[PDB]
């Protein structure tokens, strides 16, 4: 709790280097990647969602060399997404945009999410309509009320599980997550035009106001991540989302802590 | 192990070349397009013809005789004919009656990358089903899994008119010795935005102050500058490239090896 | 274009045992979900089976689960259902039918005729 001076040393800094792959609801054995092909209910009130039809955060817990009061710190994160170029296949069934046209390529709602903490990502449930009926097997909002869909504080959750937490009904929680750092765009619309960096040149630094990173409690390193790149159009007309795999390329470094 | 930066009288040099796009070349009159795009009759029997599918290019630069090793300090780099775009006028398709073509625009990836050896690539299928056509290097031993992530798919960008763009990206787990960017921007209806200027210095340099170092005396130029598609009058739509100047200064780094 | 090609049916003995055998051609048979469905003379359609291109999922409707089974041999372009405990009920001409992602059910094969009686 109390975080003392940086050690340095022979010893002193390592690294982590992972991906994370997207769940993006994995319909049947060859469709990793993919959600199953959206439909809509019937009724506002009757929303409920089948979970193939729903994109999920991934989170990844990396045991760190083991220590002891020293602490692993996390300094710097590099990560992009893989496999950018894979939304250029335009011609595998997809929608012609007009005769003889090649397909409509993967595009509209996006959700680019990525964090780094000393502990699992803290989650606030915030539901769209509080009557959807979240499906077996996700762990979903609890007790909603109508108060579910601006705020209510009961909705507290740890992104400790994958294939688990819905996208659509879960944000990092502001008033927490003192021990993460947490980055993430939602870009919204049917037509919106996926735009992907990828270099190998930018860091981005993990240390507070106060030069201190995250600090990974029981030695653990928690990546958390979400990449919803928009939908497949298929040549129906059906679309399903695509999500894609995020590098994390972590810094750590050994902090006295009491 | 990199040791100091040697000065002096003869301790700098520059390469300077363009790289040109290798986007399917149909016919002997259709360099720098890909072939009219058609599309799968079922997901599962996905399979492109290699002049439909755009590759990346490589040039292999050889640099004076020197332990020393040549450091990549800068790059200047720009879009080669981007004015050629606004040729609105060949065969293309009327946006409307008495309008004028539908210019080339849409699905853009500008890429480009300076290393001391070959751009290293992961493959990432879009779909594992896609048969890549013969006379392309692919990943090989696609399972499910190759559609989201599978580290069998490693490869080196070695081979010109090679590595299909669609299923080859720069390996991010690896390429220490190179520095890449690229941007893809999808969307049918997406702008082409094509800056060029000579003022425009990109530096090299990792956060220790290293630039890419060339093995073997070489400095490995990559691109791909896939600008969006030309629609031609049938509505029928072909990749249309473009080619990418470099501009490298170098120095001489000491190395013990 | 794509012809699938049902055999193999006939006349059984109630408690009969029977193979039917779809030939494709026309397609990559070994990239696609393949079915058996079913029509009882008059009555309308009732799906049978399906199995995966790689045979990792068989699927069965219930009025034969236990008794009948799907197989594909990929090397000779050929699905196969095994009809063991045959009933009366089960007299129908057998279709085979391909799914193709988002096309779903499309192409059929002319159907070959099982009657089951004593």
């Known amino acids: 709790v109390e975080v003392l001076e940086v050690k340095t040393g022979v010893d002193s800094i390592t690294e982590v280097e992972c991906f994370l792959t997207p769940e993006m609801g994995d319909p049947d054995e060859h469709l990793r990647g993919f959600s199953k092909s959206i439909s809509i209910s019937d009724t506002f009130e009757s929303d409920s969602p089948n979970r193939d039809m729903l994109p999920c955060y991934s989170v990844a817990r990396i045991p760190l060399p083991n220590l002891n009061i020293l602490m692993w710190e996390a300094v710097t994160l590099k990560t992009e997404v893989i496999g950018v170029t894979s939304l250029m296949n335009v011609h595998s069934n997809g929608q012609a945009t007009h005769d003889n046209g090649a397909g409509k390529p993967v595009q509209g709602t996006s959700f680019h999410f990525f964090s780094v903490g000393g502990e699992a990502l803290e989650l606030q449930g915030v539901l769209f309509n509080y009557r959807t009926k979240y499906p077996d097997g996700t762990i979903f909002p609890k007790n909603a009320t109508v108060q579910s869909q601006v705020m209510n504080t009961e909705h507290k959750a740890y992104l400790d599980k994958n294939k688990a937490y819905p996208v659509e009904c879960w944000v990092p929680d502001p008033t927490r997550n003192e021990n993460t750092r947490y980055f993430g765009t939602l870009t919204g619309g049917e037509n919106v035009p996926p735009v992907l960096h990828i270099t190998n040149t930018a860091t981005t630094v993990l240390l507070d106001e106060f030069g201190v990173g995250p600090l990974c409690k029981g030695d653990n390193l928690y990546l958390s991540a979400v990449d919803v790149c928009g939908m497949f159009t298929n040549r129906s007309g059906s679309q399903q989302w695509r999500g894609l795999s995020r590098y994390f390329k972590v810094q750590l470094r050994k902090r006295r802590v009491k | 192990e990199v040791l100091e930066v040697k000065t002096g009288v003869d301790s700098i040099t520059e390469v300077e070349c363009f790289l040109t796009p290798e986007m399917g070349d149909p016919d002997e009159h259709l360099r720098g397009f890909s072939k009219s795009i058609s599309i799968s009759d079922t997901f599962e029997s996905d399979s492109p013809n290699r002049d439909m599918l755009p590759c990346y290019s490589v040039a292999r630069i050889p640099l004076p005789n020197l332990i020393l090793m040549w450091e990549a300090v800068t790059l200047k780099t720009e879009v080669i004919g981007v004015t050629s775009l606004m040729n609105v006028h060949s065969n293309g398709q009327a946006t409307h009656d008495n309008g004028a073509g539908k210019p080339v625009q849409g699905t853009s990836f500008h890429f480009f990358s300076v290393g001391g050896e070959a751009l290293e690539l992961q493959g990432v299928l879009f779909n594992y089903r896609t048969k890549y056509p013969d006379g392309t290097i692919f990943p090989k031993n696609a399972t499910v899994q190759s559609q989201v992530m599978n580290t069998e798919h490693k490869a080196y960008l070695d081979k010109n008119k090679a590595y299909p763009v669609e299923c080859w990206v720069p390996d991010p787990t690896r390429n220490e010795n190179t520095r890449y960017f690229g941007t893809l921007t999808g969307g049918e209806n997406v702008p082409p935005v094509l800056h060029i200027t000579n003022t425009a210095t990109t530096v090299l340099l990792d956060e220790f102050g290293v630039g890419p170092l060339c093995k073997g005396d070489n400095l490995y130029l990559s691109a791909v500058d896939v600008c969006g598609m030309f629609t031609n009058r049938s509505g029928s739509q072909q990749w249309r490239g473009l080619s990418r100047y470099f501009k490298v200064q170098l120095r001489k780094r000491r190395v013990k090896n | 274009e794509v012809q699938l090609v049902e055999s193999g049916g006939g006349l059984v003995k109630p408690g009969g045992s029977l193979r039917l055998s779809c030939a494709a051609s026309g397609f990559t048979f070994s990239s696609y979900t393949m079915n058996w469905v079913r029509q009882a003379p008059g009555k309308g359609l009732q799906w049978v089976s399906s199995?995966?291109?790689?045979?990792?999922?068989?699927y069965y409707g219930d009025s034969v689960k236990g008794r009948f089974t799907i197989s594909r041999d990929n090397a000779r372009n050929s699905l196969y259902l095994q009809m063991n405990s045959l009933r009366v009920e089960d007299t129908a001409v057998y279709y085979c039918?391909?799914?193709?992602?988002?096309?779903?059910?499309?192409?059929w094969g002319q159907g070959t005729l099982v009657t089951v009686s004593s």
């Open positions: 199995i995966s291109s790689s045979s990792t999922y068989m």
């Open positions: 039918a391909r799914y193709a992602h988002d096309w779903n059910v499309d192409y």
